[PDB]
From a paper:
Adenosine triphosphate (ATP), the fuel of life, is produced in inner membranes of the mitochondria of eukaryotic cells by an embedded molecular machine with a rotary action, called ATP synthase. [name] ATP synthases occupy the inner membranes of the organelle and form dimers via specific interactions in their membrane domains. Each monomeric unit in the dimeric bovine enzyme described here is an assembly of 28 polypeptide chains of 17 different kinds, organized into a spherical catalytic globular domain that extends from the inner [name] membrane (IMM) into the [name] matrix, attached to an intrinsic membrane domain by a central stalk and a peripheral stalk (PS). This membrane-bound enzyme is a machine that transmits by a rotary action the potential energy of the transmembrane proton motive force, generated by respiration, into the catalytic sites in the extrinsic domain.
The bovine structure shows that the structures of the membrane domains of porcine ATP synthases in a tetrameric complex have been seriously misinterpreted. The structure of the dimeric bovine ATP synthase is consistent with chemical cross-linking data, and the attribution of subunits is the same as in the dimeric yeast membrane domain. The bovine structure differs significantly from those of dimeric complexes in a tetrameric form of the closely related porcine enzyme where subunit j was misidentified as subunit k, and subunit k as a hypothetical protein. Also, porcine subunit j was built as a polyalanine α-helix in the central cavity of the c8-ring, whereas the cavity is most likely to be occupied by lipids (see below), and other differences occur in the structures of subunits b, c, e, f, g, and [name]. The central cavity of the c8-ring contains a poorly defined, noisy density observed also in the porcine and yeast c-rings (S13 A–E).
Numbering used by the authors:
A (entry chain d): 125 to 158
B (entry chain g): 20 to 93
C (entry chain b): 1 to 94
D (entry chain j): 2 to 49
E (entry chain 8): 1 to 34
F (entry chain a): 4 to 226
G (entry chain k): 13 to 47
H (entry chain e): 2 to 58
The structure:
Amino acid sequence: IPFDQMTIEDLNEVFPETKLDKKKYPYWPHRPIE
Amino acid sequence: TYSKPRLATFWHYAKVELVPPTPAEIPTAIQSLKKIVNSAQTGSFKQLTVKEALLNGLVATEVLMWFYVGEIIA
Amino acid sequence: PVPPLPEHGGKVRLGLIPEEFFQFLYPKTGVTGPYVLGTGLILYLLSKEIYVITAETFSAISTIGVLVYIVKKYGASIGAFADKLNEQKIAQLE
Amino acid sequence: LQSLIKNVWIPLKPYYTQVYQEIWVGMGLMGFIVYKIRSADKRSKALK
Amino acid sequence: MPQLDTSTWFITITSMIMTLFILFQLKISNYSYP
Amino acid sequence: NLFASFIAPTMMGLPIVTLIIMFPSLLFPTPKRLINNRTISIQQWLIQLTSKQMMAIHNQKGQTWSLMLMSLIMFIGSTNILGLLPHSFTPTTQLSMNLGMAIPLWSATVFTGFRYKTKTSLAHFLPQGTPALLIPMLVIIETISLFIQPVALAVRLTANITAGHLLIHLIGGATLALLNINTMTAFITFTILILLTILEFAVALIQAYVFTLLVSLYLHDNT
Amino acid sequence: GIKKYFNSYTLTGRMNCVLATYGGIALLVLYFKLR
Amino acid sequence: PPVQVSPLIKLGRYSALFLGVAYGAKRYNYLKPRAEEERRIAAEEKKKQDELKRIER
Amino acid sequence: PLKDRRLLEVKLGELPSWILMRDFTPSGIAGAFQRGYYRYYNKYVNVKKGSVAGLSMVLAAYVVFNYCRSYKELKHERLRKYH
Amino acid sequence: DIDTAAKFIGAGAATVGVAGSGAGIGTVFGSLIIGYARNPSLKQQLFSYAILGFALSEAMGLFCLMVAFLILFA
Amino acid sequence: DIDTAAKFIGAGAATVGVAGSGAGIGTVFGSLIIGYARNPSLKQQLFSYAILGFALSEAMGLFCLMVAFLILFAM
Amino acid sequence: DIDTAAKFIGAGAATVGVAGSGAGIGTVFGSLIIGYARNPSLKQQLFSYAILGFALSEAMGLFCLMVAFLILFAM
Amino acid sequence: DIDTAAKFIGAGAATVGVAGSGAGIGTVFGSLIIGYARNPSLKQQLFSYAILGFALSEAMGLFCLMVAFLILFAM
Amino acid sequence: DIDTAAKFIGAGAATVGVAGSGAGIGTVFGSLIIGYARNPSLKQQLFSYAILGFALSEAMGLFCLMVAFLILFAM
Amino acid sequence: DIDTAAKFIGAGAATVGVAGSGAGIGTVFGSLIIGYARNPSLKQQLFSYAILGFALSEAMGLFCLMVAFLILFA
Amino acid sequence: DIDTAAKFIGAGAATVGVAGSGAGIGTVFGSLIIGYARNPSLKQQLFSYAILGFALSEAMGLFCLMVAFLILFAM
Amino acid sequence: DIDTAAKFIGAGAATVGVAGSGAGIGTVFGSLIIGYARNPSLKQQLFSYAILGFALSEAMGLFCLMVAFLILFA
């Protein structure tokens, strides 16, 4: 599916490593500012 | 400045759209006005659709405010 | 699963007033109908003093001058900037 | 309000309870300050 | 000094809260990482 | 004669000035795809940049407030800009506005600083290892310059924003008068107006930055 | 002694000293309220 | 592609022109005198006010 | 062939028939404001090459909105008295 | 009225307090320019110190306008 | 009248609170040229920290003139 | 009465004796900046001296505010 | 006229905002001298910054002077 | 009485002399900090020069403050 | 006449600015001393810079004085 | 007599100048500290220069106070 | 009389435009101290310059006060 045709959940699905895990960083931007 | 090109472009339309009236079509205008009166008196305009009425009103107002323009001359 | 974008929104004359309005008005006067319409509207408003003139008017003039300056001199560059960011995210995620 | 609650209490629950405990107390202090000033001015202008 | 005609004060302040804590905290909270 | 624009207005006898404060929130739409149009891509980039550049100093726990600081900066900057338009209204220039938006954050910082790190916070009132001659003359000064945080932190921003509006109004009035009399002065004053408009565009942003930065490092001290 | 019991460099001494001065100024201000 | 003007609007045009021009001329002519007289009376009034403040400063 | 249409499509004298074919509850006001906003959004914003016009409208509208808000106080300075 | 004319006098006089604050702010930020040019590897800490100084010298400037307004409106 | 004269003189006094502004501007630009001449590489951050101070001094100037006008035109 | 009018004017002009604290503190903190840059392993002594300087400068600047209060409220 | 009295008194006392320009000119030109003396190379660009400060100083200058003449007689 | 008003305004004005003391003390400690930054082997001698310059500036302000008190409570 | 007093009051009050001339020129020639003391080979034109700055600030102060005067001779 | 008030107010407005001497003292002793912190073996000559400048500044500082005394008492 | 008191005011005001000269002299001598502490060899020229700077600032202050003298007898 072309990049223009997805929602953030889509990459949550296809690329779990890109997930923004909600446990180790409850807040925003959901992990530190390295 | 680029006044000349666009100004000539605008004369191209003005000389064919800004013209003063000529006695030739006066009968056509008056018969059209009478036809409008006929459509009004019996309530035939009720046959029209909204868009047409909006457009007619817009053009009527177009004619109108140019009346105040005429005053602006004065 | 999302629909895509169009390629360009409705064009706009002078940057403010959409064209379609020019089309709905075409049949009766064709070309120089809407423009004289607008000129009349504005000469009316200025002439019937529904719009007085004061200092804040000239404030409006200066702010609009600055804005037209910036848009005309940087719009294309900012657009290319934005598209660069988009394709950059594409690649870097690619 | 059900749409309202499911729109502004799913995302923002963890903030009001956890982080912003110490801004509500401040808002209370402001309640004191604003009440006091409005009362004082109303009374003074009532005098006049 | 129109800022001192205290009549309005209350209503103004109220807006802050919900605005500065209800609207934006949604919009921005919705933003996502690169 | 000219304070008019600061008069909290309503079109009729109803509270509309709770919408002049809503309008900014529209200009920032929120995204739902991965990539988007421009007017979201640019704003997203801008926020990413500033978040990276401001929360550097803070320690771990303190970084919990990122959302708050950036919401505050976005809102204040948006309002201070939108105000510039021909006949627009600026909520910030109402002193009540600023006090409302200033005091609670300040007090929340002081409270999270005294509830946690009690002894250290109390100590901060004595700069480390000062001479042992002036203790009374020093732990009075730090404690008076503490309570002058919130008052300055609001009254500043209020005065900044108001001054520009007043100055542009009056210069424009003098422009119209000169145009009545002569031309050279009219033109020169119009150019002055151009310059002031630019400068006001600038300060409208500088103030948002300064406000949120002061708050940021205050939280830094007592995180 | 006091200069090691009223330390101005560590934390504890600072807290003790500041608390002492708040207490003293409080006592004085209450003293002058009568007059 | 210019579109020829419908005759109706064509006729409606210049009648409005010249009747409005006449209307403006009439307005100017009829309005000048009363306004001048009112302003002159106001001048008398302000002279009276100036004398008042001169003797009642 | 339809009871509901677009108001521009409508036939004039049926105007009261339409006014009585629709819903005027406040939810039917929210469902109208949202529709208008989304028309504007999806037509001038959510497009790859959005431009100034894709935004300048709302600003040029809010300016007139505030001008209307400001009319009453502006009636004390019209330059010419016998307008 | 003289009883308020003198009040105007006092407000106008007390206005000038901040001038010291203007001078102090300017000199501090000049010092930050120089001490960032010299050893650019300490932007962070140097900026922190400069803004701290700014806070202090703006508080000690706004005291005076606060007092001037207090005089004017009471 | 006496109130009007008092307004005028109070305004004249309020005017002179600007000097801090001019002093700060001059000094910050001197510091810029200096801290430049001996490190031409990082002109960008030098100039940025120049403009920030410029703003944080013009702010004081406007404080002063704002109070002046506030007195003159609207008590 | 003119008496109270002079009270007000005198307080308003005497509170002018705080700009001095402004400029003094500005110079002190600028010097702290520079002198910390060159010798970054003595901050503790630089800070102690800087605090001495700020404290005692602002005190001698605050005596004028105290005189304004003590001339207005009482004498 | 008493109002003319305060007219001219405010007119004079508002012309004292010019110190903010003189001090800045002095500082900026001194900074030029020192910086140029260090490095004799970037002379053009340094003088450019110098003119920019020159202008931003006479800015406050003509600012205050224009306000004085604004309420010197007319307003 | 008018005498009270004149004394009152005069004392309020005269007590502005403390500005110079603020600026002095500021620059004195600024220079001590910068100078000590270079060569810390002078602590005591440096500090002595510091105290001396301190005493002189503070005294040159104390003269004005004390004479203001003199005119207020004596004449 | 009250305004007669105001003439001289304002004219006298309208020269305190020259303080700026002092601060400037002091800083100017101080910077020149240091400069020539760091690089003796630039004297013959650092002097030109100094005379430029001196002329500038002196002119500003002296025209402020001329203001004071024209008030004095209304 | 009103000249009593004029005398008092003139003295108040005249004593103000002494701030310049405070600035000068502060500057000269700051420079002394820096100098001696550079070349600690010219100590004596450095101190001599500092004393020269000190005296030359308080000279006209006291000159200001002297004109103040003249105006207040004699005329 | 008004003129006497007004003259007194004018003098007590115009006499304040010399504090800046004090700060200026202080700065010029601070500069000379620094410069000599750098380059001991050319003492003779450091002083040859500082003296002229002092002369100029002193002259400026003397005129600033001659204003007041003339006021006293204007």
